[PDB]
Structure formats: C-alpha cells, structure tokens
Amino acid sequence: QIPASEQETLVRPKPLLLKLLKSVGAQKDTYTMKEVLFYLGQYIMTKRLYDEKQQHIVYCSNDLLGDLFGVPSFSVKEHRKIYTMIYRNLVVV
Ligand SMILES: CC[C@@H](CS(=O)(=O)C(C)(C)C)N1C(=O)[C@@H](CC(=O)O)O[C@H](c2cccc(Cl)c2)[C@H]1c1ccc(Cl)cc1
C-alpha cells in the first residue's frame, strides 16, 4: 500500500510537531519523511508512550502527541492512519 519512495519526500513540520521533533533530533528547515517517522517513533519510545507489553497501541492522551494527532491512542500497525495524522501537521516542500 505505502510505497517506500514516500519516505524520501520532503516536508516541513508545523510549530507543534517541530517542538516534539526537537526533543529527539536536531532542528532542520526541511525533513525527509524517513526522518519525521524516526524522530516521532523515537519520541514515543523514549517517553514510553508505547509499551510493547500493551498490544501495539500508543497511549498519548496525557501527552502533546495526543494534541498533535487529535486522538487518545492509536495502533502502531495502522500506518495509513498514522500518515494521515502526521500530514495534518506538516507542509510538503
Ligand atoms: C513508537 C513506535 C515506532 C518505533 S520506530 O520503529 O519508529 C523506532 C523509533 C524504533 C525506529 N514504530 C514502530 O514500532 C513500527 C511498528 C511496526 O512494526 O509497524 O513501525 C512504525 C512505523 C514506521 C514507518 C511508518 C509508519 Cl506510518 C509507522 C513506527 C512508528 C513511527 C511513528 C509513529 Cl507516529 C508511529 C509508529
């Protein structure tokens, strides 16, 4: 469904997303989606919003991430929905 070429595309995070990304990676004017996905994923793991003991679901209602995605939780395996939530928070270059 999701082509690997999508990860090479260039995007610019809006202010709130950039704030989250900055807590795990260096600030950049333009990121590749691969970068956005890793930093977002790393943020989730270091803050333990995703416990591999809790069946693929990320709980973020007590985190800025929840404000960013507009949901209290989501599955790490439903990638299509994740992409859609992320794009609400960035502008394509
Ligand atoms: C927090 C879970 C995170 C850790 S990671 O693989 O990024 C890691 C930081 C370990 C490299 N993570 C995963 O564990 C796995 C889950 C799986 O096997 O499907 O891949 C996720 C993923 C990669 C690329 C695109 C998407 Cl939409 C999701 C990805 C992910 C990235 C970003 C969001 Cl918002 C949600 C999920």
From Swiss-Prot:
Region feature (Necessary for interaction with USP2): 1-93
Induction, as annotated: By DNA damage.
Tissue specificity statement from the Swiss-Prot or TrEMBL entry: Ubiquitous. Isoform Mdm2-A, isoform Mdm2-B, isoform Mdm2-C, isoform Mdm2-D, isoform Mdm2-E, isoform Mdm2-F and isoform Mdm2-G are observed in a range of cancers but absent in normal tissues.
Compartments where located: Nucleus, Nucleoplasm; Cytoplasm; Nucleus, Nucleolus; Nucleus
All residue ranges annotated as the SWIB/MDM2 domain in the record: 9-92
Segments crossing the lipid bilayer: none
UniProt-annotated stretches for the region Sufficient to promote the mitochondrial pathway of apoptosis: 1-84
Post-translational modification: Phosphorylated at multiple sites near the RING domain by ATM upon DNA damage; this promotes its ubiquitination and degradation, preventing p53/TP53 degradation.
Domain of life of the source: Eukaryota
Disease as annotated in the protein's UniProt record: Seems to be amplified in certain tumors (including soft tissue sarcomas, osteosarcomas and gliomas). A higher frequency of splice variants lacking p53 binding domain sequences was found in late-stage and high-grade ovarian and bladder carcinomas. Four of the splice variants show loss of p53 binding. Lessel-Kubisch syndrome: An autosomal recessive progeroid syndrome characterized by short stature, pinched facial features, prematurely gray hair, scleroderma-like skin changes, small kidneys and consecutive kidney failure, followed by severe arterial hypertension.
Subunit comment: Interacts with p53/TP53, TP73/p73, RBL5 and RP11. Binds specifically to RNA. Can interact with RB1, E1A-associated protein EP300 and the E2F1 transcription factor. Forms a ternary complex with p53/TP53 and WWOX. Interacts with CDKN2AIP, RFWD3, USP7, PYHIN1, and RBBP6. Interacts with ARRB1 and ARRB2. Interacts with PSMA3. Found in a trimeric complex with MDM2, MDM4 and USP2. Interacts with USP2 (via N-terminus and C-terminus). Interacts with MDM4. Part of a complex with MDM2, DAXX, RASSF1 and USP7. Part of a complex with DAXX, MDM2 and USP7. Interacts directly with DAXX and USP7.
Domain notes: Region I is sufficient for binding p53 and inhibiting its G1 arrest and apoptosis functions. It also binds p73 and E2F1. Region II contains most of a central acidic region required for interaction with ribosomal protein L5 and a putative C4-type zinc finger. The RING finger domain which coordinates two molecules of zinc interacts specifically with RNA whether or not zinc is present and mediates the heterooligomerization with MDM4. It is also essential for its ubiquitin ligase E3 activity toward p53 and itself.
Sequence similarity: Belongs to the MDM2/MDM4 family.
Note: MDM2 RING finger mutations that failed to ubiquitinate p53 in vitro did not target p53 for degradation when expressed in cells.
Job of this protein: E3 ubiquitin-protein ligase that mediates ubiquitination of p53/TP53, leading to its degradation by the proteasome. Inhibits p53/TP53- and p73/TP73-mediated cell cycle arrest and apoptosis by binding its transcriptional activation domain. Also acts as a ubiquitin ligase E3 toward itself and ARRB1. Permits the nuclear export of p53/TP53. Promotes proteasome-dependent ubiquitin-independent degradation of retinoblastoma RB1 protein. Inhibits DAXX-mediated apoptosis by inducing its ubiquitination and degradation. Component of the TRIM28/KAP1-MDM2-p53/TP53 complex involved in stabilizing p53/TP53.
Designated name of the protein: E3 ubiquitin-protein ligase Mdm2
